[PDB]
Amino acid sequence: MDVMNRLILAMDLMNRDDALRVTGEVREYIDTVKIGYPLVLSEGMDIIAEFRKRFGCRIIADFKVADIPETNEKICRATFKAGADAIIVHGFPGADSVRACLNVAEEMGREVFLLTEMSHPGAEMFIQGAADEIARMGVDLGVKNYVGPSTRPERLSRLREIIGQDSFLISPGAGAQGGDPGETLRFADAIIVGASIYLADNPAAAAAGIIESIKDLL
């Protein structure tokens, strides 16, 4: 997919008015919005349909789907019915769980993003040791879209090595968590940015500033 300015907004405000207002402020800079459970649990799945309709943007549902295959299927169907273009799925529950999501996405013309390694310190306990194998499992499953950590560019490089140059890689952890936009974009196709933008005094200025800092990579 073609993400404008290589920048995806993580819209984790939990109030519909604040979420709509802030997203509107940065819409000229960003055409791809990640909506997760903080906003969806607070305002309902209809918020995905509303965002796509109002903003004419791509919506990635960040649901970190992590259940058994049959439940994963139900979650994916509900999510795509609401109009999401893509869904983020954990790889650690294994290949049948991921395949269930891939099957629903194929049926409905949507994409699965496989989360391979996470950005937070706790990721080092169990996920990091499995991450290379999760990525390889994704390759064998036919996964073309992946998520890996801005906070560990050496791990992004390794992930890129496994998934190849044609796969799409997006990366959270830039800004608030300490990752650097420019360094992350050496390996990832796009960065995900949340609080650095949505908690800024001027979200538009924050977005513009991030974009200026990576201007030569656009």
Ligand X SMILES: O=c1cc(O)n([C@@H]2O[C@H](COP(=O)(O)O)[C@@H](O)[C@H]2O)c(=O)[nH]1
Residue positions annotated with a catalytic role: 64
Give the H or E element holding residue 169.
Answer: strand 168-171
Which listed range, 1-9, 48-56, 167-175, 208-216, lies at the site for ligand X (CB under 6 A)? Answer: 167-175
3-state helix, strand, coil in the chain (%, to 5): 50, 20, 30
Does 208 participate in binding a second copy (rule CB under 8 A)?
A: no
CB 59 within 8 A of CB 48: yes
192 in contact with ligand X (CB under 6 A)? yes
Taking contact as CB under 6 A, which single stretch among the options 23-31, 44-52, 187-195, 210-218 is the one that binds ligand X?
187-195
Residue nearest ligand X by beta-carbon distance = 194
Helix (H, G, I), strand (E, B) or coil at 60: strand
CA pair distance 31, 55, nearest whole angstrom:
8
Q: Is 181 in the site for ligand X (CB under 6 A)?
A: no
Which of positions 125-164 make contact with a second copy (CB under 8 A)? 125-127, 130, 133-134, 137
Residue in 86, 43, 45 with CA at minimum distance from that of residue 62: 86
Per the CB < 8 A criterion, the answer to whether 193 and 7 are in contact is yes
Facing residues of 7 across strands?
191
Shortest spacing between CB 116 and ligand X, in angstroms: 9
63 half-sphere exposure, CB direction, 13 A CA radius: 26
Per-residue binding string, ligand X, 8-47, x by CB under 6 A, is --x-x-----------------------x-----------
Residues 6 or more apart whose CB falls under 8 angstroms from that of 23 comprise 9, 11, 33, 51, 55
The DSSP bridge partners found for residue 171 are 191
Lookup result for tokens 């977005």: 207
Q: Are 77 and 51 in contact (CB under 8 A)?
A: no
The 66-105 contact track toward ligand X, x by CB under 6 A, reads -xx--x----------------------------------
Q: Which position among 4, 141, 176, 200 is part of the footprint of ligand X (CB under 6 A)? A: 176
Question: How many residues in the shown chain lie near a second copy by CB under 8 A?
Answer: 46
> Binding-site residue total for ligand X (CB under 6 A)?
21
Residues that bind a second copy (CB under 8 A): 12, 14, 36-38, 40-42, 44-45, 63-64, 66-69, 71, 74-75, 78-79, 82, 90-98, 118-127, 130, 133-134, 137, 177
Chain residues binding ligand X by CB under 6 A are 10, 12, 36, 62, 67-68, 71, 118-119, 147, 149, 172-173, 175-177, 192-196
